[PDB]
Amino acid sequence: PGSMFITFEGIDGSGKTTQSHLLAEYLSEIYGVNNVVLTREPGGTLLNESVRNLLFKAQGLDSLSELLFFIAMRREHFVKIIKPSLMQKKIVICDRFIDSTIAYQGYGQGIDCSLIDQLNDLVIDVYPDITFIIDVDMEFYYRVRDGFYDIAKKNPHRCHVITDINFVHLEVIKVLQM
């Protein structure tokens, strides 16, 4: 149908995942299940999902290690799923992407955002057409949220912040179709 690359972002528990599924079902009804690819990071391939399970069972990663695993995984997910889907003119919807890395590894853990930008640019050559930031150690979580707000202000050509399951879905479609 023509490539489109949509991402959902925000804090865990914000309803990102639910919204990404609701969009997938909506777009699938219009363009056909085969033309819509619903995926997620960290994950999206068998390898990545398997690495994700290991990381979950390890905990206690150095923060830069964690960043680097997420960048490796993104590279693999981009090359195998995202970019070939786009080359084939499908719609890709990804639950968590480059903005989560900035928010969590950058603002949260304190890793330099210019490094994270460089790493993201090293591994992908297509950025999302549109990103929906769903807005719903407390000091950590305040930083992460500030990161998402800053991302939205830095990238208003791409990011749209939707505030506070059906209402949110309706605004997602509204914004998507302008």
Next chain:
Amino acid sequence: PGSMFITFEGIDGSGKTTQSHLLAEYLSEIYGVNNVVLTREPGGTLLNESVRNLLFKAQGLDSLSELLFFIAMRREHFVKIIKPSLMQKKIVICDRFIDSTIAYQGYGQGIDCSLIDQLNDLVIDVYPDITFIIDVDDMEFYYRVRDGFYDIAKKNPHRCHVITDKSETYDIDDINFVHLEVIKVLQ
């Protein structure tokens, strides 16, 4: 006893692993088993070993992805195992490290060596004191890798020592010969 970070490098089938084990035994006898830490990459921690087994079954992994997995594992390994052992003034021997990555990911796979240097410096803050590159006396890929090890040796003469695997004057089995050369560099 005194911190000392020693790495073994070279193409696969070169005897790096054997030489690393032999030196570990040699130095353990002198300094005590507690003061010699033998490790390897990719690996070194339970997570890294598990990730290594996954990667070993991965079909057609993008070379840039593979580099980044190795750099992530290196970070883990450095922070958990290598740096704290050297802080405790121990000898660390690592079978494969930063030079394998330049030779394989850079020369082999064509990834920018300057990027790989940057990624390595990003993840470690202590370089090996001594690196033994064990030299064996698609094939184009193999030969690029070999070239990579030689250029690293030429670019790092302080740190690296190329040890050839053939006794030129005495009749000595190759494994013992190389080991004796390794011990010789340490004097």
Next chain:
Amino acid sequence: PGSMFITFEGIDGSGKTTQSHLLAEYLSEIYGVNNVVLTREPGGTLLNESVRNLLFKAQGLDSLSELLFFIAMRREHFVKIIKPSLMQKKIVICDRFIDSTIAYQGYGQGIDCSLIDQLNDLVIDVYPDITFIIDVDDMEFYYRVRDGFYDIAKKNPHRCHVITFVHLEVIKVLQ
């Protein structure tokens, strides 16, 4: 969605593992894969899995030592996996937990059950909301453990429910 801590228990071969997966699938379809943590003991973390493998090849390990290894693993598992998942309002499904230790190490091996209780209360601060014991048909040893699971249920009726298709009962009881 809301924290819920569910354990499956029973003798080896009871089908508790199969049931734990099936409940995970059923709940994952309702609340999302990300809000359902499927885990197990002994295990749950890479360290615990490696230690478990060692314990499996250990010949004639002192039973109190073995108890303490399983208690150290449970603590690690609880701190790293179970508690943080529950704090994030997720559902945790654990295949084997505190009751397995009571049945195998207390009733089976003869270690004082009140010691086992004390060690369990030392390492965890959240008990399961519901425990499903799946029931099936040296045997003296095996019968004491089986009986152990009945007796635990009897002492903890507010928490344990014994099941004698099995999956449909689990879902009906959970509702």
Next chain:
Amino acid sequence: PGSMFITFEGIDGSGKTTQSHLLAEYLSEIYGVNNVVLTREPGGTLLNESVRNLLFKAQGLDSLSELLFFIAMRREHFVKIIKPSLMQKKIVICDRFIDSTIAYQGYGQGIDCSLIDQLNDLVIDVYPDITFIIDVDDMEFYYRVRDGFYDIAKKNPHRCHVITTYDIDDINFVHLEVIKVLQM
């Protein structure tokens, strides 16, 4: 020859390991190698040394998990090595034991020393006859551990001996002091 349970204690780098080997050699010369059992914690059996290697490669244990691993390993070590040796009237020398756990897990990490005492008494039913604490020269953690060893020495004045000019090595000085204390 006679049951004797000796331990060596102190912070890492203090020379505990070296002093335990030297004492093992000295006593093996007098009583015979078969009558002196040199061992260590955490470790001392194949299972324990394998667990130790896994702990090294996992890092970032909860402090209570770590304690409990060390206690499980102590139980196994006591049952298989220490108690049978003492029952045979041999001399047992252990590099690190109950006092390390108090200093590190208790004073260092903050776990209640009473809990540690109860866990120790759960797994062993004899204390060392003599314990040599070798006193050597995040830093907060370090200072707490060192303080713990001093407190242990004060609370156990019978069992514990803190060892701190002659024309010899520090290693040999400490070794001779250990021998001298032993002849009392």
